[PDB]
């Protein structure tokens, strides 16, 4: 059960929005999407799960 819980928690997707997203502050000039993808790809990352 603990292994299942850890594995479910480790991989996910984050809708991190954007810098300067709408509604923006007056005078904003940079709009960049925020990417925070803490995803695990190879075997060692899975093995490294706490």
């Amino acid at each position: 059960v603990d292994v299942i819980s850890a594995l479910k928690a480790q991989n996910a997707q984050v809708a991190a929005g954007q810098l300067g997203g709408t509604p923006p502050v007056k005078g904003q000039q940079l709009n960049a999407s925020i990417i925070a993808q803490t995803r695990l790809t190879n075997t060692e990352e899975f093995g490294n799960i706490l």
Binding site: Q13, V14, A15, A16, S33, I35, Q37
Partner: protein, 200 residues
């Protein structure tokens, strides 16, 4: 034959008058349009992967869906795009003369076959199969001459009172609202949350 009607002019007149009468009656009922149905039918598949970059969308959803979509009858060409917002749009253009309803049914079947391979996140959102168009037939704008309502109020009134009845009008394929419906916006302040030791 010409001699028969030479001797019988009233017969020929009757034939001509009957043809003309049928023509006028047909004119009364005939529809009028600029062009007949010329453009090839198109079917759109829209799926959302919330908070996924464009590269992730292409690899995870669009590639999987496109691979299965190959082989449908009377398929002319496909196109796709994966936005940074996570939306994936697969547009399938079929050969002219194809019945769009059967095309939609077949596309739905293939999408059902390909759905389990998709990420669970995009399965929760729900994928849409709809007949698609490219250009707006009409744009109807709403203004407030009194200069009392901003864009939010006008847009909310439209979304609440005009979008749906038009969306269900006969022949209206799709309606896009150039605004946004009202929503209960809660604007958090990180300083206050931290002061009260709360999190979103």
């Amino acid at each position: 034959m010409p001699n028969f009607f030479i001797d019988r002019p009233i017969f020929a007149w009757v034939i001509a008058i009957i043809i003309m009468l049928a023509g006028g009656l047909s004119i009364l009922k005939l529809p009028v349009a600029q062009y007949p149905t010329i453009a090839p039918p198109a079917i759109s598949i829209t799926a959302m992967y919330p908070g996924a970059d464009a590269e992730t969308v292409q690899n995870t959803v669009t590639q999987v869906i496109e691979q299965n979509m190959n082989g449908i009858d009377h398929l002319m060409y496909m196109s796709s795009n994966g936005d940074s917002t996570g939306t994936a749009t697969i547009t399938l253009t079929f050969e002219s003369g194809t019945d769009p309803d059967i095309a939609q049914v077949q596309v739905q079947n293939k999408l059902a076959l390909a759905t389990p391979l998709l990420p669970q996140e995009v399965q929760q959102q729900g994928i849409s199969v709809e007949k698609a168009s490219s250009s707006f037939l009409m744009v109807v704008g709403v203004i407030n001459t009194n200069g009392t309502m901003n864009q939010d109020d006008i847009s909310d009134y439209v979304a609440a009172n005009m979008k749906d009845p038009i969306s269900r009008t006969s022949g209206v394929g799709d309606v896009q609202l150039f605004g946004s419906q009202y929503a209960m916006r809660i604007w958090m302040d990180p300083n206050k949350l931290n002061n009260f030791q709360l999190t979103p």
